[PDB]
Design a binder for this molecule. Structure first.
Ligand SMILES: [Zn+2]
Ligand SMILES: [Zn+2]
Lengths: 137, 697, 731
């Protein structure tokens, strides 16, 4: 029921936008970058990974991956709707510049929309595949 | 007429005894079935008694020190009077020098037996209102709560002091009117704080930074209350909000304790849900686990009850010792935790309101009845009451039951057998109204005298002393039980016995004790041949007592199951405070019938009163229900459909806790309330009672 | 030039009239032209000794002084998809590598040959090999987390003493004027905390009428009161933070809070910045007395106490190390009128790559000098560029080993400086030794690399590479000595010697450095014979001994000495030399021998005078460039032309007692002196205030405290110093 969001280009795994708040982050950020390296043009477009007490959720659109991490108790129904809101906004604002950039995190300023959308889902008073992540890694 | 005697004594002195003729011997005092008990209302309203603005004129004896009353023997020639309690002869004060037979003081006329004095010596202290606001609730519930508090702010006196404490996960003590910044002191709702600690962490009429006069702060408070938003902390999925009710109350008590002790103050706490964190916790933050029920507390499946109850019990004694009132206004769909917090309004004179949502006419109207004024625009509430009871040397006080705290005062009027909050001649009542009714239980160890002296702080700030002196005839030795049987108040004794049963159920079988005394009362004052149940009759003085006992043992006051623990605490709360007439309505709800064949008429609480072509209006004190038969469940048909509605509106105002209204008919789901209060059955209950009254004693 | 030997007892006028220039290493022409700029990177010995035994013979310190983040006029930014680095020691491809196979380059630090990848293509003409200073775009693996946003947290002391100083008014005015000039893009976050006996947070929401002052009174158990609107987005909430900056100086005018809880306040500020990190600005005005981190009062010394420094507690050191681990840097602004134990307070900035700022006896009315100084130093502090969550590694060729670091940072792994922030005004020093004899090579190199997240959210690497030759002769080591760099490295070593031992040992080791080196030079050749490169060595060391850092018989106070040592450990070499040995000019007779090339301006070039009262004159006026200030001294018998045409006064008596600057009059004498002053402050980004207050009787003649060549009642003159050295050289 917490936060970890990353947006990366599927081809080379190039990060595009992310957002993290702690007050660990070092292990699940590696596994996130492991997955971005493994994803290709044959990977499932929508999937959910189990990592014990944590659970990854991602979608893939226009060669761009939208990954989110949360505790396994977080509703998988809400996790995909959160990635859909990010995709439609990111594709509408930067969907045509993605295959041209080469810097890591060329869209850091997407940090703003990620966090204002993030709070609309981590609050109950505001209202596909499954595989163990250790297999894909 | 004994009925005229009972009616007039309640209207004049605000008291109703179980017996108006007391046992003159030790042999009959011990064998009394229903104890000599009084249903005393210290602030009962009446046809505009003249307020006495001079000193009370007390007896010149250290131990006695009674108040001059009509039972005192006077001597207008020698300017002397004899105290009726200790036989001490006193001299009149110089202000009584021009005393005469054709112009005597008020306190000596039997009309002025109950009377109120005014003590103007010290500068009057202002009233203090502390708002303790929960912020873990829905927007529509929090907005309505905000509007209700802003309206109550507009009714307060200009001299009164006000403070604001909002809480959720944290506790905010707001420093009012601090320019353009609006600051507040944030505290963790995880650990408890003493008053001393709070004092070191925080710092002409008096006022603090946290408690300021209304006339100088009302504009900033009404803007603050208008901008109060919900608790900013997110509530994750499947979780309850972190609500620190136990610490917020302990900071409100701790705040007033180190600022204005021993003075009228009202801590009005508004709750939208149970305490999920800190001392005073009621349930965990996991929605998977429900709030405890009676079935959970009997099978030992409620790990927060005893630890949470003890926390609020210490807060209750802290505020009651200091002399402050604690109000609790709870509104939520789930339970709130009234079972754990009940001692705060019960020990003090605090109100207890329970609804489903602050955004209803039920709460909004009830909340503004709190601030109802009288013929002078002054609140119908007193503060810091001190009840002292002077009895004849033959009378001793077992104890009191009701909203009061013992001052632990010792004297020859204290009885060994203590009952309720007993073992004292003095009681403190931090909050009293024109309704607050204590139950005083006496014990004998003509004319016997009892004097009630009540010192409280009026809403105007004046200090008032209400003296009530009653007298009841001693029994004639040649007609002991005969006169005692005629002076029996079956209504008052039923409630005074109900007071004892509920006090033992709330501080634990109780029904076994309630039956052994009903059977004992049948054998001593009934007419019957031995081993002949059909011969049992009862005088018109006792005939209604078995029926009042049938409904009492089946009511929700003693059958706690099929109700939530917060509902059982709410029902018992109001019953331990109300006067006689309202208490009878709680135990035996009144039922009126409406049909074409005659005007409205009261009918029995039996299943036979439920006809198809008749409209019923059951008046439980807590709920008003209009029932339509199967035939009527469809200008002459309008007069019938609105006759109970009109009669409902009238009584749906004067009652301070506005009862819930229910419009239902045959087959409707809400007809269950009528079917459970109605009707093993009384017929079987009476036959079993007669079989035990005519056989062994 | 000069291989000649100098007799310091006969010259007595060796100081040059033009500014000192750093030496040129004895390198080949094509190699030296590509060497690093000496302002960014320089060495105490431009000729590195071949062995440690040779270095010990010279009795001179070997070390590096670097200014890695200095503002540059031009910077090559390589955005290569691959960063060519040596496969062994990870040294960056630098201009001093050895290309052989044209597809294989020999690393100039570990001598391993590496394969030149295709992307590189004429491999040597690529910018990474044509620039000793270069900035790379770090790839994905060069960061532990997404680039952090710029987070600025300002923490203000609001006690009764702080309100009396009136500093809050001007600081809030600087933030309002520089709100749009703060480095960062739309991700910038800003927060505010005030404290006294309790910590005061400030929530900023657009749905509320006004900010909310959330006060946490639990001093022993601090927490964060609100999760969202404490560190707010500056771009969205600009209007909200502007009202608070206008409302803050008005809230505490009638305060009776006499104590200050700095310790717990910094813990509250740490918890608030822990998730993201950033720059934490602390403004303290008195001794911390309440709560954790409280400090006891000390009695200030006098001119009579002997040289009998270190912090009294380790709270502010432990807290700074926690700030470093969370990428939080703490800059301390001390505006104290009494002793505040800066020896302990300074640890919050030393071990967190921060920087302390000291304004003694600040007062909005009584001290206009400190007011304008704070205004200008805040104008620089708020508008200069900045890098976040930074690390720096200093490399050198095999055989040379760095063994001691100097500056504001945390040393994680020998050679791995953690920089929670990196600022362009910070200087660093390093001491090294020859662990393995350099018999193999004739060149040795040094490389510093600075990984940081810019204010625009881009992980960048700035790399500097230095190359020096190796010699094996005692004389060759002396011929390449940098007298300024040696003085700076000795000043850093002396500060550590003070904390480590005492002030006496620090002063003695400084004097022994001049004795041992010149005695070693004499034992390898009547008067005091020194080489040409060390003719100013006893001068700059005597000036070091009379600086407020190491002086003894002066009436200096504790916080002044600690702050002077904090400037030694953190200032670049130039400003350290300008502070120690200010440049003294005469300015009442400027003329046309200047730099009149600058289009329309002439800009006189008056000769630099030696720091002696003998060089002054009661008939003229003398300006002293002390680096951070410009003290203009006016003589009593000053000419009437300088009074009315430059100062705007008709006689010496009516020169205003506290003069904050010169007037810009319509006189050619004013145009000359304003041109010379403006040209001085254009050689630096830290705008120095200039006060003419130095009269012959203003009771503020600390202008004379910099005359380091004259004798005083408790220090030797420059000639007395040379006499003492000669007695020890040939003892
Ligand atoms: Zn008496
Ligand atoms: Zn290498």
């Amino acid at each position: 029921m917490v936060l970890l969001t990353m947006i990366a280009r599927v081809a080379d795994g190039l990060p595009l936008a992310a957002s993290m708040q702690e007050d660990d982050l070092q292990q699940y950020q590696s596994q996130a970058k492991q997955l971005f390296r493994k994803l290709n043009e044959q990977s499932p477009t929508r999937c959910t990974l189990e990592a014990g007490a944590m659970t990854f959720h991602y979608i893939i659109e226009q060669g761009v991956c939208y990954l989110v991490l949360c505790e396994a108790a977080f509703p998988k129904k809400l996790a995909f709707a959160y990635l859909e809101d990010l995709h439609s906004e990111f594709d509408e604002q930067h969907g045509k510049k993605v295959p041209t950039v080469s810097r890591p995190y060329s869209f850091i300023e997407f940090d703003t929309f990620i966090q204002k959308t993030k709070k609309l889902y981590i609050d109950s008073r505001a209202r596909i595949m499954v595989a163990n992540i250790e297999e894909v890694l | 007429t004994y009925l005229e005697f009972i009616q007039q004594n309640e209207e004049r002195d605000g008291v109703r005894f179980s017996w108006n003729v007391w046992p003159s011997s030790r042999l009959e005092a011990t064998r009394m079935v229903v104890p000599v008990a009084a249903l005393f209302t210290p602030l009962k309203e009446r046809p505009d008694l003249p307020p006495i603005q001079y000193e009370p004129v007390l007896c010149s004896r250290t131990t006695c020190r009674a108040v001059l009353n009509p039972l005192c023997q006077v001597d207008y020639r020698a300017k002397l009077w004899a105290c009726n309690f200790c036989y001490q002869r006193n001299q009149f004060p110089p202000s009584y020098a021009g005393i005469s037979e054709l112009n005597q003081p008020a306190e000596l006329l039997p009309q002025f037996s109950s009377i109120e004095y005014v003590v103007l010596r010290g500068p009057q202290m202002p009233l203090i209102f502390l708002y303790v606001v929960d912020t873990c609730m829905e927007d529509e519930d929090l907005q309505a709560l905000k509007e209700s508090m802003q309206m109550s702010l507009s009714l307060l006196p200009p001299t009164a002091l006000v403070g604001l404490i909002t809480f959720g996960r944290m506790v905010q003590v707001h420093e009012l009117g601090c320019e353009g910044i609006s600051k507040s002191y944030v505290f963790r709702g995880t650990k408890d704080l003493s008053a001393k600690q709070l004092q070191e962490m925080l710092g002409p009429p008096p006022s603090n930074r946290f408690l300021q006069p209304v006339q100088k702060i009302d504009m900033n408070l009404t803007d603050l209350l208008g901008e109060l938003q919900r608790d900013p902390w997110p509530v994750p999925q499947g979780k309850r909000p972190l609500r620190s009710s136990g610490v917020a109350l302990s900071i409100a008590v701790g705040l007033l304790e180190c600022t204005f002790p021993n003075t009228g103050a009202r801590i009005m706490m508004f709750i939208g849900g149970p305490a999920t964190q800190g001392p005073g916790m009621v349930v965990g933050d996991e929605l998977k686990t429900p709030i405890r029920s009676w079935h959970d507390i009997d099978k030992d499946n409620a790990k927060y009850v005893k630890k949470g109850t003890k926390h609020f019990e210490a807060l209750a004694n802290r505020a009651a010792t200091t002399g402050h009132v604690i109000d609790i206004y709870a509104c939520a769909l789930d339970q709130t935790g009234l079972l754990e917090m009940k001692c705060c309004p019960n020990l003090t004179g605090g109100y207890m309101v329970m609804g489903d949502s602050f955004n209803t006419s039920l709460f909004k109207q009830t909340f503004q009845r709190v601030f109802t004024k009288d013929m002078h625009g002054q609140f119908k509430m007193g503060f810091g009451g001190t009840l002292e009871i002077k009895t004849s040397r033959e009378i001793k006080i077992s104890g009191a039951i009701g909203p009061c705290v013992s001052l632990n005062s010792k004297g020859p009027c204290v009885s060994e057998n203590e009952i309720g909050t007993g073992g004292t001649c003095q009681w403190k009542i931090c909050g009293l109204s024109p309704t607050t009714t204590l139950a005083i239980y006496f014990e004998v160890v003509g004319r016997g005298a009892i004097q009630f002296v009540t010192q409280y702080q009026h809403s105007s700030g004046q200090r008032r002393i209400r003296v009530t002196t009653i007298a009841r005839n001693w029994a004639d030795a040649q007609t002991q039980i005969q006169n005692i049987a005629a002076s029996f108040d079956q209504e008052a004794a039923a409630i005074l016995m109900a007071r004892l049963a509920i006090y033992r159920a709330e501080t634990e079988d109780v029904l076994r004790w309630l039956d052994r005394q009903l059977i004992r009362l049948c054998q001593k004052f009934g007419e019957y041949h031995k081993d002949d149940p059909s011969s049992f009759r009862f005088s018109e003085t006792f005939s209604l007592y078995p029926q009042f006992m049938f409904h009492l043992r089946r009511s929700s006051f003693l059958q706690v199951f099929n109700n939530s623990p917060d509902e059982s605490s709410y029902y018992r709360h109001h019953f331990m405070r109300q006067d006689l007439t309202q208490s009878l309505i709680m135990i035996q709800p009144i039922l009126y019938a409406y049909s074409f064949s005659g005007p409205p008429e009261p009918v029995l609480l039996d299943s036979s009163s439920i006809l198809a072509d008749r409209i019923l209006l059951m008046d439980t004190f807590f709920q008003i229900l209009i029932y339509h038969g199967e035939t009527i469940a469809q200008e002459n048909f309008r007069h019938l459909l609105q006759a109970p509605v009109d009669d409902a509106q009238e009584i749906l105002h004067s009652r301070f806790p506005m009862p819930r209204y229910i419009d239902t008919e045959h087959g409707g789901s809400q007809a269950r309330f009528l079917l459970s209060k109605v009707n093993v059955s009384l017929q079987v209950f009476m036959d079993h009672l007669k079989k035990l009254a005519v056989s062994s004693a | 030039e000069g291989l000649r030997v100098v007799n310091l007892l006969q010259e007595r006028n060796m100081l040059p009239s033009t500014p000192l220039k750093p030496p040129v290493p004895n390198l080949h022409e094509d190699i030296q032209k590509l060497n690093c700029n000496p302002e960014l990177f320089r060495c105490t010995l431009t000729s590195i000794p071949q062995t440690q035994a040779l270095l010990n013979k010279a009795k001179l310190p070997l070390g590096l002084l670097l200014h890695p983040f200095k503002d540059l006029v031009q910077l090559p930014v390589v955005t290569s998809s691959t960063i060519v680095r040596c496969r062994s020691c990870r040294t960056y491809i630098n201009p001093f590598v050895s290309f052989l196979d044209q597809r294989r380059w020999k690393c100039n630090l570990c001598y391993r040959v590496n394969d030149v990848p295709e992307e590189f293509l004429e491999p040597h003409r690529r910018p990474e090999v044509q620039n000793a200073t270069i900035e790379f775009m770090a790839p994905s693996e060069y960061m532990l987390r997404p680039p952090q946003p710029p987070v600025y947290l300002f923490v203000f002391d609001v006690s009764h003493n702080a309100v009396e100083t009136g500093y809050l008014n001007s600081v809030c005015q600087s933030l309002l004027d520089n709100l749009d000039l703060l480095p960062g893009n739309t991700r910038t976050k800003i927060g505010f905390i005030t404290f006294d006996s309790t910590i005061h947070f400030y929530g900023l929401q657009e749905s509320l009428s006004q900010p909310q002052m959330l006060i946490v009174s639990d001093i022993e158990d601090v927490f964060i009161p609100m999760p969202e609107n404490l560190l707010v987005n500056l771009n969205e909430s600009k209007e909200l933070v502007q009202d608070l900056l206008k409302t803050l100086p008005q809230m505490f005018t009638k305060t009776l809070e006499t104590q200050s809880a700095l310790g717990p306040a910094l813990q509250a500020a740490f918890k608030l910045m822990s998730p993201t990190g950033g720059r934490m600005s602390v403004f303290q005005t008195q001794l911390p007395t309440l709560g954790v981190g409280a400090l006891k009062p000390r009695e200030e010394p006098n001119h009579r106490s002997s040289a009998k420094m270190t912090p009294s507690t380790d709270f502010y050191k432990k807290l700074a190390l926690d700030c470093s681990g969370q990428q939080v840097a703490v800059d301390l602004f001390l505006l104290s009128g009494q002793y505040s134990d800066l020896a302990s307070l300074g640890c919050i900035s030393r071990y967190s790559a921060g920087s302390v700022y000291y304004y003694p006896s600040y007062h909005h009315q009584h001290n206009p000098v400190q007011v304008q100084k704070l205004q200008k130093e805040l104008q620089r502090y708020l508008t200069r560029k900045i890098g976040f969550e930074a690390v720096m590694r200093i490399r050198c060729t095999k055989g040379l080993s760095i063994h001691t670091f100097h500056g504001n940072f945390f040393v994680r792994s020998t050679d791995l400086l953690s920089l929670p922030n990196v600022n362009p005004d910070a200087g660093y020093a390093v001491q090294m030794s020859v662990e393995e004899s350099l018999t193999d090579t004739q060149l040795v190199s040094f490389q510093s690399a600075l990984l940081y997240t810019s204010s625009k959210g881009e992980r960048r690497i700035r790399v500097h590479t230095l190359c020096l030759p190796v010699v094996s002769t005692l004389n060759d080591v002396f011929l390449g000595a940098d007298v300024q760099a040696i003085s700076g490295l000795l000043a850093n070593m002396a500060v550590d010697r003070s904390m480590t031992a005492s002030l006496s040992d620090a002063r003695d080791a400084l004097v022994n450095a001049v004795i041992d080196s010149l005695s070693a030079y004499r034992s390898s050749v009547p008067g005091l014979m020194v080489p040409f490169s060390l003719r100013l060595f006893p001068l700059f060391v005597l000036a070091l001994l009379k600086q407020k850092s190491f002086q003894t018989g002066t009436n200096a106070r504790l916080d002044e000495r600690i702050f002077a040592m904090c400037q030694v450990k953190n200032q670049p070499l130039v400003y350290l030399m300008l502070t120690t040995h200010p440049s003294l000019y005469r300015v009442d007779n400027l003329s046309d021998e200047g730099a009149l090339n600058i289009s329309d301006r002439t800009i006189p070039q008056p000769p630099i005078l030696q720091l002696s009262v003998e060089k002054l004159s009661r008939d003229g006026a003398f300006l002293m460039d002390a680096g951070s200030v410009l003290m203009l001294w006016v003589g009593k018998n000053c000419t009437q032309n300088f009074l009315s045409q430059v100062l705007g006064v008709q006689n010496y008596a009516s020169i205003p007692q506290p003069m904050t600057d010169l007037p810009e009059l319509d006189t050619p004498e004013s145009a000359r002196i304003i041109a010379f002053i403006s040209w001085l402050r254009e050689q630096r980004p830290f705008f120095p205030i200039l006060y003419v207050i130095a009269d012959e009787s203003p009771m503020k003649a600390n202008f004379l405290q910099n005359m380091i060549e004259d004798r005083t009642e408790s220090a030797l003159s420059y000639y007395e110093f040379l006499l003492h050295i000669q007695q020890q050289v040939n003892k």
